[PDB]
Design an enzyme around this catalytic site. Structure first.
Site, PDB file in Angstrom:
ATOM      1  N   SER A   1       0.770  -1.290  -0.042  1.00 46.17           N
ATOM      2  CA  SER A   1      -0.187   0.002   0.019  1.00 46.17           C
ATOM      3  C   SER A   1       0.833   1.076   0.160  1.00 46.17           C
ATOM      4  O   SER A   1       0.480   2.355  -0.579  1.00 46.17           O
ATOM      5  CB  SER A   1      -0.954   0.046   1.156  1.00 46.17           C
ATOM      6  OG  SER A   1      -1.975  -1.002   1.170  1.00 46.17           O
TER       7      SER A   1
ATOM      8  N   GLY B   1     -10.260   1.197  -3.037  1.00 48.17           N
ATOM      9  CA  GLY B   1     -11.038   0.751  -2.003  1.00 48.17           C
ATOM     10  C   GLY B   1     -11.956   1.561  -1.129  1.00 48.17           C
ATOM     11  O   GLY B   1     -13.124   1.311  -1.089  1.00 48.17           O
TER      12      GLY B   1
ATOM     13  N   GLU C   1     -24.268  13.895   7.995  1.00 48.26           N
ATOM     14  CA  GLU C   1     -24.084  13.997   9.351  1.00 48.26           C
ATOM     15  C   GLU C   1     -22.501  13.564   9.454  1.00 48.26           C
ATOM     16  O   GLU C   1     -21.791  14.308  10.381  1.00 48.26           O
ATOM     17  CB  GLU C   1     -24.612  13.426  10.385  1.00 48.26           C
ATOM     18  CG  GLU C   1     -26.394  13.921  10.211  1.00 48.26           C
ATOM     19  CD  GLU C   1     -27.455  13.463   9.401  1.00 48.26           C
ATOM     20  OE1 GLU C   1     -26.898  12.331   8.784  1.00 48.26           O
ATOM     21  OE2 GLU C   1     -28.318  13.968   9.166  1.00 48.26           O
TER      22      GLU C   1
ATOM     23  N   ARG D   1     -37.001  19.169  22.980  1.00 51.81           N
ATOM     24  CA  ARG D   1     -38.031  19.916  22.364  1.00 51.81           C
ATOM     25  C   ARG D   1     -39.077  20.329  23.147  1.00 51.81           C
ATOM     26  O   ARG D   1     -39.603  21.521  22.791  1.00 51.81           O
ATOM     27  CB  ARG D   1     -38.726  18.698  21.346  1.00 51.81           C
ATOM     28  CG  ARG D   1     -39.503  19.406  20.516  1.00 51.81           C
ATOM     29  CD  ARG D   1     -40.216  18.301  19.385  1.00 51.81           C
ATOM     30  NE  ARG D   1     -40.966  18.823  18.411  1.00 51.81           N
ATOM     31  CZ  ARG D   1     -42.465  19.038  18.638  1.00 51.81           C
ATOM     32  NH1 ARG D   1     -42.982  18.883  19.729  1.00 51.81           N
ATOM     33  NH2 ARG D   1     -42.926  19.742  17.652  1.00 51.81           N
TER      34      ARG D   1
HETATM   35  C1  LIG Z   1     -13.853   2.062   7.604  1.00 52.53           C
HETATM   36  C2  LIG Z   1     -12.912   0.911   7.306  1.00 52.53           C
HETATM   37  N1  LIG Z   1     -13.333  -0.539   7.045  1.00 52.53           N
HETATM   38  C3  LIG Z   1     -12.416  -1.303   6.873  1.00 52.53           C
HETATM   39  C4  LIG Z   1     -11.008  -1.129   7.104  1.00 52.53           C
HETATM   40  C5  LIG Z   1      -9.895  -2.115   6.859  1.00 52.53           C
HETATM   41  N2  LIG Z   1      -9.123  -1.969   5.857  1.00 52.53           N
HETATM   42  C6  LIG Z   1      -7.954  -1.643   6.162  1.00 52.53           C
HETATM   43  S1  LIG Z   1      -7.035  -1.128   4.623  1.00 52.53           S
HETATM   44  C7  LIG Z   1      -8.390  -1.830   3.688  1.00 52.53           C
HETATM   45  C8  LIG Z   1      -8.397  -1.911   2.056  1.00 52.53           C
HETATM   46  C9  LIG Z   1      -8.199  -0.501   1.653  1.00 52.53           C
HETATM   47  O1  LIG Z   1      -7.818  -0.537   0.133  1.00 52.53           O
HETATM   48  P1  LIG Z   1      -7.390   0.687  -0.705  1.00 52.53           P
HETATM   49  O2  LIG Z   1      -8.189   2.040  -0.128  1.00 52.53           O
HETATM   50  O3  LIG Z   1      -7.602   0.218  -2.047  1.00 52.53           O
HETATM   51  O4  LIG Z   1      -6.030   1.130  -0.193  1.00 52.53           O
HETATM   52  P2  LIG Z   1      -4.753   0.442  -0.569  1.00 52.53           P
HETATM   53  O5  LIG Z   1      -4.332  -0.676   0.442  1.00 52.53           O
HETATM   54  O6  LIG Z   1      -4.881  -0.707  -2.008  1.00 52.53           O
HETATM   55  O7  LIG Z   1      -3.945   1.439  -1.218  1.00 52.53           O
HETATM   56  C10 LIG Z   1      -9.141  -2.408   4.373  1.00 52.53           C
HETATM   57  C11 LIG Z   1     -10.708  -2.773   4.059  1.00 52.53           C
HETATM   58  C12 LIG Z   1     -10.683   0.225   7.677  1.00 52.53           C
HETATM   59  N3  LIG Z   1      -9.538   0.570   8.018  1.00 52.53           N
HETATM   60  N4  LIG Z   1     -11.322   1.145   7.915  1.00 52.53           N
HETATM   61  C1  LIG Z   2     -30.461  11.050   8.649  1.00 54.17           C
HETATM   62  C2  LIG Z   2     -31.671  12.251   9.066  1.00 54.17           C
HETATM   63  N1  LIG Z   2     -30.992  13.549   9.020  1.00 54.17           N
HETATM   64  C3  LIG Z   2     -31.989  14.501   9.268  1.00 54.17           C
HETATM   65  C4  LIG Z   2     -33.255  14.263   9.357  1.00 54.17           C
HETATM   66  C5  LIG Z   2     -34.091  15.402   9.640  1.00 54.17           C
HETATM   67  N2  LIG Z   2     -34.973  15.582   8.408  1.00 54.17           N
HETATM   68  C6  LIG Z   2     -36.327  15.256   8.461  1.00 54.17           C
HETATM   69  S1  LIG Z   2     -37.034  15.581   6.842  1.00 54.17           S
HETATM   70  C7  LIG Z   2     -35.606  16.592   6.319  1.00 54.17           C
HETATM   71  C8  LIG Z   2     -35.575  17.109   4.985  1.00 54.17           C
HETATM   72  C9  LIG Z   2     -35.680  15.977   3.748  1.00 54.17           C
HETATM   73  O1  LIG Z   2     -35.614  16.754   2.661  1.00 54.17           O
HETATM   74  P1  LIG Z   2     -35.753  16.020   1.247  1.00 54.17           P
HETATM   75  O2  LIG Z   2     -35.164  14.838   1.221  1.00 54.17           O
HETATM   76  O3  LIG Z   2     -35.875  16.881   0.091  1.00 54.17           O
HETATM   77  O4  LIG Z   2     -37.493  15.513   1.228  1.00 54.17           O
HETATM   78  P2  LIG Z   2     -39.032  16.121   0.804  1.00 54.17           P
HETATM   79  O5  LIG Z   2     -39.354  16.609   2.214  1.00 54.17           O
HETATM   80  O6  LIG Z   2     -38.309  17.588   0.281  1.00 54.17           O
HETATM   81  O7  LIG Z   2     -39.543  15.314   0.058  1.00 54.17           O
HETATM   82  C10 LIG Z   2     -34.674  16.285   7.338  1.00 54.17           C
HETATM   83  C11 LIG Z   2     -33.393  16.912   7.093  1.00 54.17           C
HETATM   84  C12 LIG Z   2     -33.601  12.905   8.861  1.00 54.17           C
HETATM   85  N3  LIG Z   2     -34.991  12.671   9.426  1.00 54.17           N
HETATM   86  N4  LIG Z   2     -32.815  11.893   8.798  1.00 54.17           N
HETATM   87 CA   LIG Z   3      -6.416   0.073  -3.343  1.00 58.31          CA
END
Ligand SMILES: Cc1ncc(C[n+]2csc(CCOP(=O)(O)OP(=O)(O)O)c2C)c(N)n1
Ligand SMILES: Cc1ncc(C[n+]2csc(CCOP(=O)(O)OP(=O)(O)O)c2C)c(N)n1
Ligand SMILES: [Ca+2]
Ligand SMILES: [Ca+2]
Lengths: 613, 613
Positions: free
Chosen positions: B33, B149, B359, B467
């Site tokens: 890597s 990846g 988020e 709330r």
């Molecule tokens: C969120 C997350 N999931 C899984 C891992 C496990 N993991 C460590 S390296 C790797 C592979 C990453 O491949 P890539 O992005 O192609 O980097 P490369 O080593 O090929 O340059 C994984 C799955 C991690 N570190 N983080």
């Molecule tokens: C993961 C997440 N983050 C925030 C909220 C708060 N929330 C409820 S509805 C809404 C807006 C969604 O807008 P959109 O996808 O354009 O749907 P529409 O109501 O316009 O059809 C949000 C931010 C949520 N329900 N879930």
């Molecule tokens: Ca890779």
């Protein structure tokens, strides 16, 4: 044909009316979000989809997922229009006395997964669709309705890539592009071209439509599908509500009573006929699936004294159970060589789903696969990376899902990779999931037994597995049950009960040996399940050890084994509880060196015991 | 410049050699890597970037983020090549006695954010670049190196969309398209065209390069930049390792000693000159930032008895603190009308970052902005959707980040929206984060005081807001501290200590009122911070009330206030503890109806008290 087209429009306008009536009656809800989707919902439920209107959970039905779950009133309205729900009940939306809750939930026969946390629906739908195409090999299709604001969630794009990788031509996403999110315009507003470019870049066939044209909707859905299809619908939030259509500051604001009467009259006056469209039934080609208990095809065949990492025993056990049942499937997020799920892939490749480095999606895929009891999934990755999917797991519980998660590489005992890889908050996280059973197996034997039990336990099961090789300590005929701990070392003169698990169980046993040199005996107890906790055996053991309990865990202090035990026993006369855990973010070293550094090795256990007398 | 090109090639190969030597010495790590990235790293650190080799944290430096943190050995190698690290230290990779840990961490002066959990680096880079362009308005650029990846993570695509929305033309992402991930090829392998289309679709200027050609690399970095730039580099995993390059089954596998010596010899034979390139310093145009404590411009101005939701108090307090210092920035995930962070937007629009419904990215942006102490961020959404960012929060602790998070709509008291919106596991989640301070303010005044404390407290601060509009109970001159609780009701004949917070403190106070009718007095205690808990005041209160403690919380049983209190007092001689909390997934209803249903309202409290004597 011109009668069916007009009936669809009329249906859409009925669907608008009901969304308004229900939310005005509740005094809360999201009418403008329902109104942008009315034609979409009309064409879906009364033209395109094939389903049994009196049997929503029927295994041959098309599926619909309402990823924009706050439009729940128009889902409720479509199932009234279809004759499943009573029209009068619509008005009871959001009441304590009704099952028509503010966002959809699976107490509703017509809902498979709870939505509400945006961005999760399409992943569940990928699960359903993958199951459709590759496991039950049926003709049913899967339709998912998303908002435009919702498309900012990364989880959506994992699901998009997954669908094209796995050629889910039985899947259709409809994008409600109504320009607005909750508190402002969606970033891309009505730049339909860019939405098309993004979808196409992720491998979808993308069709731009006017989302308030029932004609264009029908043509779009009618096109041949050779890949996952994205219908990108240009719409207006609050469509058909005079003075509100396309305006800011109306998200989640119900119409007041008097204004709603005016609005409803105007929409109603657009309706040319009251005759309802009937749903078209599906072809019944989904296979039968047997819901019996799944048993390992034999007892475990380990040898007491041999060494095996619980992560490798998980792999062997999963592969072994995959021979007892066709329903067992395995998912993994590019860590199959670390979690040992690759063993299942080798033996049962048709039922392995490579989810790549996309933990949020992996969890959603599993939830989808488990809907309507079609499969029994086990997802795996490092336990630390399940924190990436916590909102999906939380929603899994709200969806009353039966999924099984196995998180490897728990604790500081992984050694050299350092803290980004160390699960130290996974007990806290999983214990906080309402329907969860948490297995922390200490042995290859206990691991095999956890896998079997998890497959047959309702709700969310987590199996915490470990990297280091430890001794088999259980006989193969040992009997394991949820909520039943084991005393693995005892004598008539035990001075402390020491509770450990996984690596700290073995450190506790090594500590017993160092202590027997000084004529100090300790009782050692392996919990097996951390949730629920065998309160009784813990208490009976304490009372045999002058009331003294010491807990030792490869986890942070908060939410872990120590806290479970303390709250289980607080206020019992005579009982004292002391803890060993990890007090801060760790660092790289050898496994044995980190266990010492963080005060949870045999020497730390022995030294805590001597301090308790 | 032909001497220069050859020196970059020689540098690339010195970097491979070192990656191999260090990982072979350690017995673990990821040399293949590192090797795919050797030319990328050489060109970045010894041609493109501007920084002070002897002061990595210097606020005028270009930033580098190693998103694929398992490449840490080549990071370490470039910092030896620049003369900051001693070369001999590289062989102590991963040792308990070295700070050259398995993945980068901020104990290393050259590291601002810990990576290790893939897909998070670009978000932090986005925050640094936003800061660079709009807050310190300085000339520095930000470079982020990702794996292929790693691009399956949804968090990456949030960051990409954010960067084009906010015109971050000072940000460059380099994509190491080495075909392979950990356990199989990456989905798109070497389909460079599709990478290009996905990047372009998300508003980046995408340049495909041969990632092993220093010339193409220099050309790409030198192009004009009018938008965020993606350098999409075709590379081979294990580049320059005979017999390993582009092969499967080599991820995270160190070369054994005799093989490593033969490979190193072959690579060394390609090196024409030993002469190291020197780093070019930056233009020093970042402004000074004051490090002083940020105080509210005045004391709180609420009125005892008036009614205000803590969520609204938060918005008001943040906006007010925003007048005291231009270092306060506010970020929100399309929920600003619900968390009241819109008040800050209105008053200080230049310092509000709309993150949209993403988020994960929001938390990463905050962490990026806080690096090198440039800003003091407060991110806001519903507490429940912080579970979506749990890994980013977990990694922020490992990054030793000082960020503040405010989660609104906690508990069943939100009412009608139902469980998807209800935070019932957030205390567990945030308690398990090692550097966390958890505030749970019970009124407007406590909320203003929490915001001010949070700004000035090191680590991750969580403020749980609610709330419902509850009464102001504290006078404006009340003094609050981290770790100090408040007894809000007491008398000489108190029979139980009842601990509540937020809505349950107000329910407890109303319960006191019902009970005084039957001549039963209770002591009511508001913890203020759940972590750290005021153990002393809790014990002293319990000792004046016959040892009896009752905890009441709008949160699940596991990991909440109840378990934190149980674990603080367990084994104390006086002491009994009983808990009221939420026992299962909730449902829709009026706030008061859900509080009653889940047994945490005035009547349940009153009855629990009667059952304790
Ligand atoms: C969120 C997350 N999931 C899984 C891992 C496990 N993991 C460590 S390296 C790797 C592979 C990453 O491949 P890539 O992005 O192609 O980097 P490369 O080593 O090929 O340059 C994984 C799955 C991690 N570190 N983080
Ligand atoms: C993961 C997440 N983050 C925030 C909220 C708060 N929330 C409820 S509805 C809404 C807006 C969604 O807008 P959109 O996808 O354009 O749907 P529409 O109501 O316009 O059809 C949000 C931010 C949520 N329900 N879930
Ligand atoms: Ca890779
Ligand atoms: Ca929208």
């Amino acid at each position: 044909s011109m009668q069916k087209l007009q009936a669809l429009k009329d249906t859409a306008n009925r669907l608008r009316i009901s969304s308004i009536q229900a939310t005005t009656a509740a005094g809360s809800g999201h009418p403008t979000s329902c109104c942008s989707a009315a034609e979409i919902m009309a064409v879906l439920f009364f033209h395109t989809m094939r389903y049994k209107s009196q049997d929503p959970r029927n295994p041959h039905n098309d599926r619909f997922v309402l990823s924009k779950g706050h439009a729940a009133p128009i889902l409720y309205a479509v199932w009234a229009e279809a004759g499943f729900l009573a029209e009068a009940e619509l008005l009871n939306l959001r009441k304590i006395s009704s099952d028509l809750d503010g966002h959809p939930v699976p107490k509703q026969a017509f809902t498979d997964v709870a939505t509400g946390s945006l961005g999760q629906g399409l992943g569940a739908a990928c699960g359903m669709a993958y199951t459709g195409k590759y496991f039950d090999k049926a003709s049913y299709r899967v339709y998912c309705l998303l908002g435009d604001g919702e498309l900012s969630e990364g989880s959506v794009w994992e699901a998009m890539a997954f669908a094209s990788i796995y050629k889910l031509d039985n899947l259709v996403a409809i994008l409600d592009i109504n320009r607005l999110g909750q508190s402002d315009p969606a970033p891309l507003q009505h730049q339909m071209d860019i939405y098309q470019k993004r979808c196409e870049a992720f491998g979808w066939h993308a069709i731009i439509v006017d989302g308030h044209s029932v004609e264009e909707l029908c043509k779009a859905f009618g096109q041949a599908k050779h890949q996952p299809t994205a219908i990108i619908a240009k719409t207006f939030k609050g469509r058909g509500i005079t003075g509100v259509e396309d305006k800011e500051s109306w998200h989640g604001k119900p119409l007041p009573k008097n204004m709603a009467e005016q609005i409803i009259q105007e929409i109603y006056s657009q309706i040319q006929s009251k005759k309802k469209i009937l749903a078209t039934p599906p072809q019944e080609d989904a296979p039968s699936v047997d819901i019996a208990n799944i048993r390992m095809p034999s007892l475990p065949s380990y040898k007491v004294g041999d060494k095996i990492a619980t992560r490798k025993a998980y792999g062997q056990a999963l592969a072994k159970l995959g021979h007892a049942s066709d329903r067992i499937i395995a998912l993994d997020g590019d860590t199959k060589n670390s979690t040992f799920s690759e063993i299942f892939k080798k033996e049962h490749p048709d039922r392995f789903i490579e989810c790549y480095i996309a933990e949020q999606n992996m969890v959603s895929i599993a939830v989808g696969c488990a809907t309507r009891n079609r499969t029994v999934p086990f997802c795996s990755t490092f336990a630390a990376f399940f924190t990436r999917a916590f909102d999906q797991i939380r929603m899994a519980a709200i969806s009353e899902s039966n999924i099984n998660l196995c998180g490897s590489h728990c604790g500081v005992s992984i050694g050299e990779d350092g803290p980004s890889q160390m699960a130290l908050e996974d007990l806290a996280m999983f214990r906080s999931v309402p329907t969860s059973t948490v297995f922390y197996p200490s042995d290859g034997v206990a691991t095999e037994k956890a896998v079997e039990l998890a497959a047959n336990t309702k709700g969310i099961c987590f199996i915490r597995t470990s990297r280091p090789e430890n001794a088999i300590i259980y006989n193969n005929n040992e009997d394991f049950q949820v909520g039943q701990a084991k005393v693995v070392l005892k004598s008539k003169d035990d001075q402390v009960t020491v509770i450990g698990a996984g690596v700290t169980l073995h450190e506790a046993l090594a500590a017993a040996e160092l202590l027997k040199k000084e004529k100090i005996n300790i009782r050692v107890l392996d919990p097996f399940t951390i949730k629920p906790l065998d309160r009784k055996l813990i208490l009976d053991s304490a009372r045999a050890t002058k009331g003294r309990i010491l807990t030792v865990e490869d986890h942070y202090y908060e939410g872990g084994i120590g806290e479970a035990v303390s709250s289980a026993v607080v206020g019992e006369p005579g009982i004292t509880v002391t803890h060993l855990a990890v007090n801060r973010v760790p660092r790289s070293g050898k496994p044995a060196e980190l266990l010492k550094m963080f005060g949870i090795d045999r020497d730390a256990i022995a030294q805590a015991v001597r301090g308790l007398i």
